[PDB]
Every structure is written in C-alpha cells, then in structure tokens.
Design a protein around this nucleic acid. Sequence first.
RNA 1: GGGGUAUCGCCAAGCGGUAAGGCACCGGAUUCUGAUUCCGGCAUUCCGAGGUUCGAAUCCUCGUACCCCAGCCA
Length: 529
Amino acid sequence: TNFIRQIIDEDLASGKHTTVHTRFPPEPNGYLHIGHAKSICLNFGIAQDYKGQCNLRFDDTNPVKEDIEYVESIKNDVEWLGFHWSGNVRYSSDYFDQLHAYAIELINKGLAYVDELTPEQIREYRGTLTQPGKNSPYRDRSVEENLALFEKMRAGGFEEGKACLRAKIDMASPFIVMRDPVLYRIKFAEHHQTGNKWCIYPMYDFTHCISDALEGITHSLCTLEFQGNRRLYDWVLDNITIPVHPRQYEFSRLNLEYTVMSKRKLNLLVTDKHVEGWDDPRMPTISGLRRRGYTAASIREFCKRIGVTKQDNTIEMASLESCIREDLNENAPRAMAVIDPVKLVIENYQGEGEMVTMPNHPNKPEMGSRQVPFSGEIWIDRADFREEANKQYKRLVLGKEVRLRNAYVIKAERVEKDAEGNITTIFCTYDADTLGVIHWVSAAHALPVEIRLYDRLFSVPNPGAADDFLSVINPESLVIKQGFAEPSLKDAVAGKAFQFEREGYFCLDSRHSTAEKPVFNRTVGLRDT
RNA sequence: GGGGUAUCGCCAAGCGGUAAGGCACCGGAUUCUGAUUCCGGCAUUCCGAGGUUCGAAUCCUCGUACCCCAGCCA
Ligand SMILES: Nc1ncnc2c1ncn2[C@@H]1O[C@H](COP(=O)(O)OP(=O)(O)OP(=O)(O)O)[C@@H](O)[C@H]1O
C-alpha cells in the first residue's frame, strides 16, 4: 500500500469510482529506462490489482523529437516486463481532430487567442519567478479574429514561431504555467503517425488532460515536476464540454546512484558512441538491463521494494543488484569458467582424462547434473594461486592442498615462471582417494569464451549533478577478458543466466556471440566478502 | 513569488496509545561456491525550539533545510 492506493481505496469506498483506469504515457523519443519501469509497475500493477484497465498511450505531440523506432521498442519493453495494456495502443495523435475542436471551443468562449509575440518576446512578457507577467498586445482580438488567424495557422499561412495559440488565463498568476500557456505551435515537420496532415501541434498540457478524459482515465499518475501543471490540467477540463474530469496525482521520480536517466543525456552517450547503443549492458535502459542479464521478475521486485512516496530519493545500486542476485541464485544453473587463466598440470595423473559428475545446482538436487570432463592438465584462475600468503587466504598456496571444484584435492608443488617473473604454469600432485575450493577447466575440453566484465558507467554517484557528465565516465565500465568455460556452455541461449561459480551470474550476449566464440556479459558479481 | 518534502548509511511503514520492513553493515553457526541458508546486533528516537495531552513522530505555534516552476519540450 502507498499513498496512491489509499486514495484509490477511498475513491472506491466512497463510491466516487466503481472502476480504476490508469495509463502509461511515454513520449516516443527514446528507449524506456529503469525509472520508467517504476511508472509501468505503478500504473499497470494498480490496474491488475483492482481488476481495472491501464492504457498504453504514446504521448506523441512533438514530431521533431519522436521516431517510429521508439514506439516498437516501447511496446516491446512493456510486454517484456510482463504487463499488457487495455485494448489497442493509443496515441495522442489519435486525438488531433478532437484537440483541434476543443481549441475552437476555447476560442469561441474568448478563452484563447492567436498571439504574435515572437518566441523571444513571449519569454520577456511572461514575468519571472517573483515578477508578474504582462498581457500581450494581441490579447484582446475578437473571437471572429482568432478563428480566422487560427485557421490560417492550421492552413500553414504562418511561419514557424510566427504565431501560436495561447490560453487567456492570468499573466500575474503565481503559477508560471497559468500565464497564458501556449496550446498550439507551428511545426512543419512530418509526424510519424499523421504524416504531413498537420502543421500545427498541441502542447503537452492541452493534449494530456483531454486525452485522459476521452479515455475515461480515473487517476492520472505522474511525477512530481507536474504538480504545478495540475492547475492547467484542471483549468482545461473545467472550460470545455467534456463529461468527466480525471484527477492527477504526483509521486516522486526514481534516481539511481551512479547513472543518469535524462533521455537527453542517454541520447548523448549513444549519439557520441560512448556506449554501443540504447541496449548497451551499461545503460540504465530496460533493454540494456535485459541484455545485461536482468530478469523482468527482478525489476518488478525492485519496483516493489523502492516504494511510491512524495519524497525525493536516490536508491543505491546495491538495492538493484540485491534483486537480480536473489533471482538468479534460485534459478540459475551453476557452471565453470575461468576468466584470467594460468595453466596447471597434475603430473601424478594417469589417462587421457576422465569424467566428473557435477550438479547443476548445489542447493537444489532437483535441477539435474552433468558430466564435466576432468583431466591432469587443466586451467585455473591466476588470482587463485599464491606462492606465499597468510592464514586468511583459503586457496592454493605453494605449500598446502586445495580442493578442485567437485574433483580432486590437489597439492601445489613446483611453479614454472616466465622470464618476466610471471607464473606460466603450475605443477601439483593429487590422491585419487579424494572425491580451500577453487574452480577449474580441463584444458583439453576448454571452450574459449570471451567474457565482458561490466562495471558502473560513472565514477561519481550523481553524474547528473556534474558540469560535464561525460568527463566523469568510468573508463573501466567494460573490461574484456578471454577465458575458458566447460564445453557445456556450448549450448547456452541468449539471455539465460548461468552462475559461473565463485565469479558471478553471466549470460550470453546475443549481440556479439557466434559459433566458435561465445560472448558472456557478467550480469552481477557475487557477494565478494 | 508559488507549489511540495522532512523517520537509521540508502529506501520505507506509522494517521494520539509509547518507532514495521528491506538494502547495506557487524558479529556467531553451517557449507566442496570467501556464495546460499541460519543466529543475533543494528532510531528511548522521528529537521529545530517551544505548546496542548495521562500519553505526540504523529495536534499547535514559530523557525530551518532541500526539491520543483520562468520550452512555441514532456
Ligand atoms: N525517473 C522516473 N521515475 C519515475 N517515473 C518516471 C521517471 N522518468 C519518467 N517517469 C514516468 O514515465 C512517464 C513517461 O515519461 P516520458 O517518456 O513521457 O518522459 P521522461 O522520460 O520523464 O522525460 P525525458 O524524455 O526527458 O527522459 C512519465 O509520466 C513519468 O510518470
């Protein structure tokens, strides 16, 4: 329960409403991100919790910033999270004729006029945050005059910025938004849905409340920056012949630590090619998060945890990571892979190898097991062997013995160094009666696999508050290794999380893998305590 | 000038009857993943100072801090 559900509860109880109809209205000018996933969870969750409806509506009022590529991807990520909208996908452009009729009602009532103050002047006349504005000299044109000028606008007789339609409200209102807000502006741009049918386009505030009213939305839920806007939401509905009047309720937007959400910015990372694109595994986008190896279930959980309040806030990545870990620990089948490897040969070994039956899940016998080939000449992780180390160190020291994962208790003996003092190979003994744990991969049956170690994109917690967020990008956000994995990883499917034991949960990058060379993105590391 | 918000390091519940929960953190037990699981510790205190009350985070003053708004963006 949250403050919005308590409102919805009262409404139902008092008999204000019988059903609840919410909506998610992204503008199609970019890919959805983790913050959007919070609206999706809120809006679609309430609908299904109350057996109500939730429309997916593309708020497509600004043609020059939107593109058809985003509509298809948005529908894509909404479904992926496991949510379905009510009926058909809707578009604000679906209401362009309605919106136009409504502007006319306003004009006929004298509550709107065609102003000719330039784009620079309108700002000058608007006042400031402490100084009231002033009426444009074009404010008292006759209704008959406004209809003519508006139709001329509609007919493309005015150049961009040469005229716009404004609401005749209050230039001295303490709400900057009520200072004669623009309702329509001229843009000679092709619209991704309406082609070149329209050269005048409605502004968010005029389009949004009328669309909600037409769709019979009972509660418009948006973020806190729209609290002021709400006054205009109600003013529009109060002055046009519409039979319902939805109510807006604002909650606080999600801010994730170490990442930026501003689509303007995310777009710059993609435009300047600093990431591979919107679905780069370092991006806070839903598709990026998906390619990274997250699961819709881990995200819905994240939403459940962070809550819905009016408080500004900033979640730590630790909270997000906790979610995916919890999910993958349960459902991810374990496997073996070595990221940085140094060869290890057991001399006391007899035979061209053998087979070790390893389980697909150490805490869930029900998941089955597999035949992992064991051998004498294997591959181990460089950071697992140490010539000298204290008690704490519970791995392979040049002195004692260590257990190979589900195999034999080997025993370090000699080490063969390369010219530059680097260990090239290790020599050890073992006693076949055995069967300090480390992971390994039989060199003979090792599958060369590229591993991508992803880290946080930025090196400060609020790169948003930086003068130049770009200069604060983490150069180690992606570190590419070459390692080896047990041959079973040959059958991995894109987006199927595996837990490389003692490393983390990884998943096959569908975008870079092939036949010989598979690419694995590291979703999240283990609790490296 | 106006509109909001103030509860553990980060989220968050509480709606006059005496501070839930989660992430993180610290221990202690188990463990062929320094993982998982288990055990326990984690706000006499709710931005501050004063009021009312038997009892206030919650009600009342009176301050303080932060966030939002001046796109023909959403
Ligand atoms: N960080 C966020 N946290 C919660 N809800 C968000 C967040 N960002 C956007 N939303 C929600 O998603 C809805 C659709 O957002 P929309 O795509 O229209 O714009 P935006 O993403 O907020 O802005 P921009 O295009 O500049 O990134 C908004 O009405 C809002 O409720």
